[PDB]
């Protein structure tokens, strides 16, 4: 598997599991997490997520007591080991019971060490469907 | 239409139209497509095609004699108006009838004027397809 498959398929198993630990092992020290690119609920300002300190953070808040569903419905290899592009399916579910899910295309680009530096989301709310 | 969505649709009916400098009129002077992402026959040293002087010769190299045909398949909005992604299938036809066929996952980006700064695809030769 490229070093782009492996951190990718390893980012969904530990947010799954809800690995703290495991999750930011697989973070680069200058990640940037755009989930989605531009303004949103999850990306206030636009800028992304920025350092391993606040992807734990969102973590912390965000992941710890809820529960996330990720679904990879197709993936698409580039001609680089280190960039890859994947349909997902996330679905969140806050206790006690709303619920959100959105289908969207996510990239990532890891470094030379194989670690993630970029994950960006292509959604929006309206493409969000609730219950 | 968002930005990013106008620049994207005109990119693809100016290629299909063979029109070099209508499709250069849509790219910012710092453009950079990596068409695709990492090192191949349309991205030679991987880091891209940059400028529209390298643009322009990329297009004389690959689209001037090329039947070429742009389908979109699927377009994913992100929460920028200026980024945006696609699953396009991508058919050629060159040299006495040989085809080309790729399918996948294709981001663009544009800057404050509009103008594209970044096209980018998620494909590799051994995804392609022939005849
Ligand atoms: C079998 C190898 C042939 C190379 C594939 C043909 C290159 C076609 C490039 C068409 C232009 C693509 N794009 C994204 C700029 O529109």
Chains 1, 2 share one sequence.
């Not at 606040?54 to 001609?79: K, M, Q, W």
């Not at 806050?94 to 990532?108: A, C, I, K, L, Q």
Request: proline share 4%.
């Amino acid at each position: 598997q490229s070093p782009a498959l492996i951190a990718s398929q390893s980012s969904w198993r530990c947010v799954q599991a809800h690995d703290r630990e495991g999750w930011l092992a697989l973070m680069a020290d200058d990640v940037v997490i755009e989930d989605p690119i531009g303004k949103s609920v999850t990306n206030p300002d636009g800028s992304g997520i920025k350092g391993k300190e606040a992807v734990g953070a969102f973590f912390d808040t965000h992941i710890a007591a809820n529960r996330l569903t990720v679904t990879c419905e197709e993936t698409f290899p580039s001609s680089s080991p280190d960039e890859i592009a994947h349909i997902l399916v996330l679905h969140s579910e806050f206790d006690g019971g709303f619920t959100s899910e959105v289908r969207g295309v996510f990239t990532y680009r890891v470094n030379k060490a194989g670690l993630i530096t970029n994950m960006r989301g292509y959604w929006n709310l309206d493409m969000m469907t609730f219950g």
